[PDB]
Amino acid sequence: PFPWNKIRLPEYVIPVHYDLLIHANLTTLTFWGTTKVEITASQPTSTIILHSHHLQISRATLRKGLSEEPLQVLEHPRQEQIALLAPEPLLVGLPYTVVIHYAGNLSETFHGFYKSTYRTKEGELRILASTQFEPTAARMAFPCFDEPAFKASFSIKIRREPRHLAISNMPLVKSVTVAEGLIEDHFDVTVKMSTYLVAFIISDFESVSKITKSGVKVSVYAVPDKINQADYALDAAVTLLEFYEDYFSIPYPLPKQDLAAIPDFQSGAMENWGLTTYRESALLFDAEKSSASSKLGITMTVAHELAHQWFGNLVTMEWWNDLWLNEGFAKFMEFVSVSVTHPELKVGDYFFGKCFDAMEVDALNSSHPVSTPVENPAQIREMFDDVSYDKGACILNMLREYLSADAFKSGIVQYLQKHSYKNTKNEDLWDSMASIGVDVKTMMNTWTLQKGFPLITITVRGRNVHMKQEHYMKGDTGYLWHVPLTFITSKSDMVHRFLLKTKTDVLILPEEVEWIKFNVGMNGYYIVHYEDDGWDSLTGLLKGTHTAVSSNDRASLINNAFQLVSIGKLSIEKALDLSLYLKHETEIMPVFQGLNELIPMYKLMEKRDMNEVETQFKAFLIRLLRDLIDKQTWTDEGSVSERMLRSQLLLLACVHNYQPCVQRAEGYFRKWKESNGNLSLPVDVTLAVFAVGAQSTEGWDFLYSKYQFSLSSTEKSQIEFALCRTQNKEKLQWLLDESFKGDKIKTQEFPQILTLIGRNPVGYPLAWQFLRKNWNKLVQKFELGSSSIAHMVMGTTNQFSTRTRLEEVKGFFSSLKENGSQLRCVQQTIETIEENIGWMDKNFDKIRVWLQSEKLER
Template sequence: MSNRVTLPVDVVPSHYSLVLTPNFQSLDFTCDESVTVSVVTAVDEVTLHSKEIYIESVSFVSDDAKVAPTVVGISYNTKYNTVKFTFDGLLPVGNGKLLIKYRGILNGDMAGFYKSTYADANGTKKIMASTQFEALDARRAFPCWDEPAAKATFSVTLVIPAHLTALSNMPELSTTHLPSSNGQQLKKVVFDTSPKMSTYLLAWAVGEFDFVQGVTKGGVMLRVFSPPGRGPQGKFALDVGIRSLDFYDEYFKVPYPLPKLDMICITEFAMGAMENWGLVTYRETALMIDEATASPQQKQRVAVVVAHELAHQWFGNLVTMQWWEGLWLNEGFAAYMEHFCTDVLFPEYKMWEQFTTGGFSNAQRLDALKSSHPVIVPIQHAEEVEQVFDAISYNKGSTVVNMVSAFLGADKFKEGLQLYMKRHAYGNTETVDLWNAWSEVSGKDVAALMKSWTTVVGYPYLKVVDEKWTDSAVEVTLEQGRFLSDGSTTAEDDAELWSIPLVFATNGSSSQEAVLMDQKRQTFSIPL
């Protein structure tokens, strides 16, 4: 959309190579970064996102030109968190590499590349470092095109103290021990190249870890990493992770595309969890439990969070929103699938009964207020995403996805998702692309149904205004209007219309398919 504030598209990335060296004493890090880019239009400046990073040097090397322009200026924009490199001539159209040396900080903000403290097996306090990039904090770890549509592949190398473990999205390719530096033995850990993905899904972690592991039916190695001495507390999450991955493989009919999946406990973590592709990070209580003493509620929480994050490995990671206003569907769908998957794995939890009193009821309560807002809120500046994405979007998002499932039926709902995954794998989509996939397999106009539920504030109530009975049927006239919990509905509120799927049931029959009410007042005939 033209009103979105994004970086210029004259130069676009295709691959990042990062060689990072964290320092646990000075709590900072250095990096040699190489970005493979395509120069679409000859320009003399390149703008990337960057925050709290000090650029030491930058140069450009063209694949074709013998002489490349030289950088003559580096300027920072703290309002938009960008850095601009100005050259003494035009960058030639074609492919090249942007080479950047820089320094950053291991901050304590639980965002970007940051430090956490943990206790080892002896109770001694230690420091680990890990990443949290969603939504806008990859730029705190490396200069980049920090937008979901700017997908690229990534190669990560970490130079770390020899006694520590390094993890990233992809499996380790090699480990090389290096000569001592300032009396400290170091090693260089090189990871395989990632699939094409958004910057917010890149991740790495460095520390002392124990782990438990297993393998899915599809041959994917799954590991759960924990602070030293607590490995067994990851066994329940490991079991849920393996079974969830197998379930999603079969459900989406697109095999999990990475060779491994790690889930790691981060002792200082601002979120519940984060779906980084192949290296999912968790708050301690969402991953680690002692099965012998854990309550059913604690086990359910772990199961639900794991099912939620692994749903994202397809919906969000494999297929990603084009822009941040699509985040509602990303999270709303995962919130729906956490119930769906957990219900299959643990039917005794009665997840759909809990959904009625949980997410659905929360959505109704919040959306019945005058202060509510539509599920889809246009986002001009990426920084607005944290302000507009809230419980209304999250809870109502999962509820309307559940409504689509009921409207289409389980088989067409699943078939549409499988088409969507195959058609848009490794790409970016707008919300309408999912509606189109469901419409294509079902023959129903899903976009028309969903428009009112995602762009109109609130939700309707139905009033029976007339009924006529015969021996074989009842004719019911219904009227819709906006429901507000304080009863302050105005004429303007009542003018809104929703497309409402209705299912009728009597003692003798029930509707085989939902029918749509899309008028202010509408009459339906119900067989008895």
């Protein structure tokens, strides 16, 4: 019988130091290790439980300090634990070293100690071996006390062949020849840290480097054929690292930081201390072929991972229930940092957007509080979602606006200083912020310990402004938040603030107003509804003088109008009437928000027998933006904002067959193709151009023939997108089969390819079938409940709208039993489908008839 029956490890055996030897064979795909960990026991025990997953342990011994003893090894593969059995008890307070020799196979997934491949520009296959342990995979590389609060120092030794280069968290102290054809690289001992942050990579990478003003050596690593795309990320890393050292008032503790581009990577990037890892697409920039969105993306990702060096590495959450302490803060700092470091990106314009994303999931019963209990690996992995990231960021933005920016800054600095090299709970952050009436802790508990967000309802009767709060949920709570409300009026540009702490309250204006708008700049995780003549007043404002409020305010009105349709407070008709203001809009955020609210309506239709209204609805959309579409140049000119807007509108108009866009596109593609790819296309039109070109066999085959050889993450992305738009079912199967096989398109792309095909009007049946027939191998490759699996579940089902379809979805996921039926994402699609059924049963006919009335304009 295994002597320990909990998922969590015992509390009373604590490691202080690991000494890790790793010898990998990149030709036989095998590895051998020797882990030594120094421990002490606070209670007496002759059993030591630690984590191990898929390692074959050959031998385990216990050292006293001279004296050595063999330990009996027991295995519990479900708990992912081994029991080491001592012949004598451990004496309390005395030091012991546990020594374990074991072996493994390089993982073929994207986690643990795993295999990654690439092609040389001369066509030769190349293997490297990299790591990804967050949250629970460290234990697949080396046996350990694999929970984030057992922090320890690490001394890492990698044995390898001369032709390879090894890198890890810390600098290389020395390289020792241990046998003919075998070198041992010794890395310097780390600072105290969590096991999930250990990293190592064995490759033939090349590097470029730059020294910060503070003496940190920053380096980017990539494969030899792509190292000339590292320059932009290197400049960015230096600037951002310098920024944070100043902002947090705590220098970066390590002598070097490396940023490595991995050719096979499941997430976008990872914060391992001193050795941050990235998808190639999240790190490498090509001056001539990369997009504005990709440049924006590299900067933010680097910003994010370097933020983690303080938030996550230096100060770490005690347990994964409080993961948002790492991920919410990192996501937020992206915006804090990059808006000083790269003001030309104007990233603050886009902050709002994440908040609305979170609200899509958070408005459902299947959401969870920011801070919420989890126990097993799949549960822990599911914390890496939009609540921990995006709501975590949003509520911090909210707290920040509520104290000064300086006060906020002071709190986080005291917090980082006090908890340096340690672990925090949710309550520790609040004690810090509470020590800079004002009660931050009660306030921030409402935002972290209960799910969802409030609807604030505004009633104006003369000078009295009645504010009311209740819990927003799509189909009892009595939940209450402390909401920092902001607002502006027709009489002053000055922003007014009210802390609504109660179900209702009232303020008195010094004079009556033509109009009033709440949640200014959308710095608040809540939505607003206006009673009486309120929305007609706001709709009249956007139709007469839209620039009376900001872009961001316009975007928030659009979103809230449609969110309120979904719970019955506003009619679909009044919201679409508001949409009409977009005829005159010019700014990226409200145009994109409109689209975010309107495209999904035709998406639901596309999956039904509804072609008359689908077509009317799409005509209306293009007509709504037609002026802004016709005003776009087929160039790469302007700000990042202008470019992203350009690229999206051109794609949109061409996908909906607006004939002037299409003919131009056809023409660009013909000349491109007839030069055999030699002509340079403007990057911003290339999506639109490839999408049109891929509608012919000639064009699709041609496009695919360039994918083989491309080195540009953007160009590959653009080709992927275009090929997935084909209406030939045999080609959509191929793409699905191939990316899954991973040889001609890499499997890291499969999730998104599966989603784009699920979005294809004639592809959705194929994508839903493929996910079902291939579930087990996909779960093995990506893990339950990773984001990837989550994105696949929702990407293939969340646009369904019928009961027949709901029963399909329910029946499949139920059959999976212990292998997927408890997944949070499955509950989320189900409730999404359920909301789709009712939204469409109510509004379908209303839209049909509204589209007709809106031609009493002709």
